[PDB]
Ligand binder design. Structure first.
Ligand code: 2T1
Ligand code: ZN
Ligand code: ZN
Ligand code: ZN
Lengths: 61, 176
């Protein structure tokens, strides 16, 4: 259900369902729970390691 | 100014890592190709017991038109035969995953007011630079005194980057 992903530099159990911001930036995918876009409120994973459910959310745009 | 070969650029004479340490605010920048810090760019330079220089760089990153974040990077400088030319290995911390390795030249500084930095990432066959970036740093987050401004303009022309810089703000987005 949740996935081991790094968020604000810390290993967290991330529910991909609740991500509200996602973006490809370079070779990495950045994501956030936060609709307000707090300046450091985000996590990231390399494109190659990204869970498919995260990629699906990204590509649906 | 008319010889634009990176080999022919003067850099800071007898550059002094210790006098350069502390906080430098980027007041203007010349972008390289690709992705880059946007504004609110602050660099903190340090010298350890060994004499090895280090720096942190913080600034705003634009992930999407509607999504601005802040990113921190750390850099470690390997000395060259030239006291002002370094090779800088750098990487993002926390959840910023960008990293790389760039030349890092201190083109000029008075250590108390201003500095001009320069990095050529790709050289043309004829020795001119095909992809560079450059910062104008100030000890003051908001401006440079006119004396400094005159010198900076001269150095930009010497780098063959005259009129290619953009002013960039410091509005607290990443430090308050
Ligand atoms: O280089 C990339 O691939 C990149 C990609 C996305 C966003 C930003 C990026 N890179 C930069 O913004 N910069 C400017 C800061 C620079 C740095 C880092 C750490 C310590 C000091 C410095 C110094 F050179 F500015 F002093 C590293 C290159
Ligand atoms: Zn000089
Ligand atoms: Zn001031
Ligand atoms: Zn500030």
């Amino acid at each position: 259900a949740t996935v081991k992903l790094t968020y604000q530099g810390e290993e967290k159990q991330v529910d991909i369902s609740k991500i509200k911001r996602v973006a490809r930036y370079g070779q990495n995918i950045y994501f956030s729970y936060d609709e307000g876009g707090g300046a450091y409120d985000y996590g990231a994973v390399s494109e190659k390691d990204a869970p498919k459910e995260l990629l699906q959310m990204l590509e649906k745009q | 100014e008319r010889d634009c070969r990176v080999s022919s650029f003067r850099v800071k004479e007898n550059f002094d890592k210790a006098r350069f340490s502390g906080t430098w605010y980027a007041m203007a920048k010349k972008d390289p190709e690709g992705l880059f810090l946007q504004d609110n760019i602050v660099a903190e330079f340090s010298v350890d017991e060994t004499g090895q220089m280090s720096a942190t760089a913080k600034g705003r990153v634009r992930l999407l038109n509607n999504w601005d974040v802040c990113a921190d990077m750390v850099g470690t400088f390997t000395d060259t035969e030239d006291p002002a030319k370094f090779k800088m290995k750098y990487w993002g911390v926390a959840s910023f995953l960008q990293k790389g390795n760039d030349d890092h030249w201190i083109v000029d500084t008075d250590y108390d007011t201003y500095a001009v930095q320069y990095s050529c990432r790709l050289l043309n066959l004829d020795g001119t630079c095909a992809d560079s970036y450059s910062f104008v740093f100030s000890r003051d987050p908001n401006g440079l005194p006119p004396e400094a401004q005159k010198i900076v303009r001269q150095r930009q022309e010497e780098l063959c980057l005259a009129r290619q810089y953009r002013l960039i703000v410091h509005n607290g987005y990443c430090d308050g």
